[PDB]
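User: My advisor, Dr. K., asked me to get a structural model of this assembly before our group meeting. I'm new to this, so sorry if the format is off. These are the inputs:
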Amino acid sequence: IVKTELEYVEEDSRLRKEKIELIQKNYDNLNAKPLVGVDLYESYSLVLNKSAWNYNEIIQRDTQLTILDMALQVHLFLYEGKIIDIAHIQKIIKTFVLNVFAKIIKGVPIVLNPIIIFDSVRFDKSKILPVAVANPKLMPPLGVQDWDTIVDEDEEIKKIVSTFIKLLENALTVGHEVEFFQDTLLVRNVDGITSLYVSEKAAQVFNNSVIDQIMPEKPKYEALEDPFS
Amino acid sequence: INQTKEIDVNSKIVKTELEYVEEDSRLRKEKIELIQKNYDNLNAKPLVG
Amino acid sequence: LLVRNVDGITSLYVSEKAAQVFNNS
Amino acid sequence: NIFANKIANQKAYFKRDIKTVHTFLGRVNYIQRASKFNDEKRVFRPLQIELSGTNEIVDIYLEATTYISKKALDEIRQNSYIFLEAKWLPESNFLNNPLFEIQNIVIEN
Amino acid sequence: SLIDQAEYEVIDYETSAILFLLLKKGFLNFYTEKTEALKVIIGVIKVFLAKDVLGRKMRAILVEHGIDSIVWNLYLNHMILPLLKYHLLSELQYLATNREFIKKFKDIRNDGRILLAYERKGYERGIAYDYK
Amino acid sequence: EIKNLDKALSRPERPIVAILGGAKVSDKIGVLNNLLKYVDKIIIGGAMAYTFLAAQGIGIGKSLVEEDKIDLAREYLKNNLDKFVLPIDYALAKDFEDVKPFYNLENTLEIPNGYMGLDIGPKSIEVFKKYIKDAKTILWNGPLGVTEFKYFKEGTKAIAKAITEYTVVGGGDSVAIIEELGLDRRFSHVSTGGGATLEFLEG
Amino acid sequence: KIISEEKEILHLIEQSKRDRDFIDNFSKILEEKNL
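Assistant: The format is fine. Below is the predicted structure of the whole assembly, which you can bring to the meeting.
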């Protein structure tokens, strides 16, 4: 019904406080639990269990960016007059991450940035685990290679991969959870500490690969599919 | 004499509204800082240590 | 064994017994 | 040059009328969102400015009434460095901190 | 409801087109004559397409070329809808229980953690990546 | 040596001027670090002065500067603004040889690209004399210019002549040039060592 | 003493609101400077 000017002021204040409570309730409705971790690379099973649980929890939060998202961000960022195919960029990104995967299972760390370095942990034969580490201060990594080594010399491909790396770094800095391998997830924890949470399917592909050299299939040009259909 | 005097409406509205705006902004900034620190504390631990 | 890779980075790979003799010393 | 890229982002707003103004010159430590109070016609923005040459923290409020004034007020972010000239408004008598109106401003982000 | 418009209010061409496509895809079914909902949507889209680093390129693509249905669906699903969903759920209380709103916005990515920090930094209510 | 330094530091007579002549940011870093909350005015002249100028956004071109500390330099400029003095008139040089100096008729604060910042101009020394015209203590801890070349050795000599007309000098090269100038008597105390005196004055 | 200080403050606030809402001199409107 009709209201007095004082009642209008009261209604304004009520709406502002309602919006504050909505701010709190938006975080509350995201049913989330603090990410759990361990302190030492003691056993393969414990680290795998923690990583799988963390990945499952972040997936059920539904706040992560897939490879399609980063490909679309690269497509938007590289626009200067001509349209670059989204599928082409997605295929190139998947090929790059597969090259990183093949290089790190052979004990060669790959440096994408002064902050993130992709490495591998072997506990025994048939037991390996991908990790992301910071640059060490006193023990230089053994045979560390830049990403530029494993990318074709063509200007378009190199530009696409550089843009993808830059956008991934920015997304990690702001606080996103980016997917790097298939069914794996890249997160930036407190300070400048980066972590790689591996699902069970990915641990499996990494173990089959380290066991009988069964590498993942070659990336193929995939047509864009409708999220709404 | 008593029945004549009454509570004004212009100055009361102006002053009340100004104090409501200041209190609302202060409360919102406190809630924002607490919410963000809760988000930071939700994703701030090393996986392996 | 000491190797220089593609980025001209040299590394020294130590066997188990070499590290054992290092630690004994 | 560190400041070379800041030049292309300069935004300068001014009025041809000259009143008595309070001059602030420094970095924006914290700036909140905007509030509509006078019958949803005005814009209220609380500002925390770290001045230059003294490095002290002062708290002010900014008022916007026109479309161009709101556009100029929306350019102020965190860590933005401002040379702001502000006319005092007589509504500060009921406020903890002074309320101001932008006369001239130069914004770099 | 889309027809109505305040005096001297300029609604951008791409904002109008995006509103039309949202209407045609059923992303306005929850509407029950709450003007602030469309005001929020229009403001968010306007700021995103005018000031965001990637939104500006999206707007240039929309202006220059003619995109197809699949690319528009990807654009809406992966950038526009998360921003709209967060900025709607934080201003409209009744949207929490609105069956249509959950029925349409359940699978949309949650982006509260980043948009919070953008708000706390003094950014406008539509920046999702950064200022160009 | 101890008595004069103790009188200048513990019993200072304000206003106080501490001109630390140094061509290395680190060289006088400690000395300046000792005068941030213990002096009224500090003057920076030398290569570290051009480092400070680089931290100011003004192009240095061929003039060297301690890049690894540049941010710290800027921090100093942020902490103390009035307590810092920098030259405004620059006499550039074609190279490091003993060629005639090159000045700029307009906008002399800017160093053109290709030339090296060599000497302090007449305007900066005029400002120095105008400021030091009211100063009870005038310290010194290093040379104000390069003396290996005659065309660029006039800065420290001119500064000493202006200051002589308390006067304490303790520079490694400034003291020797002052003694060679012939104004030793006018100085209140000329120390026999440059680095040791500055280290003692630091604390 | 006829007019209280509180009422004078209210009158000042109202007059400032009127001067902001309706502008007679066009030199009082903010102008964006070309760069």
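One thing worth pointing out at the meeting: Helices of chain A lie at 5-29, 44-61, 67-77, 86-104, 155-174, 200-212.

User: Perfect, thanks a lot.
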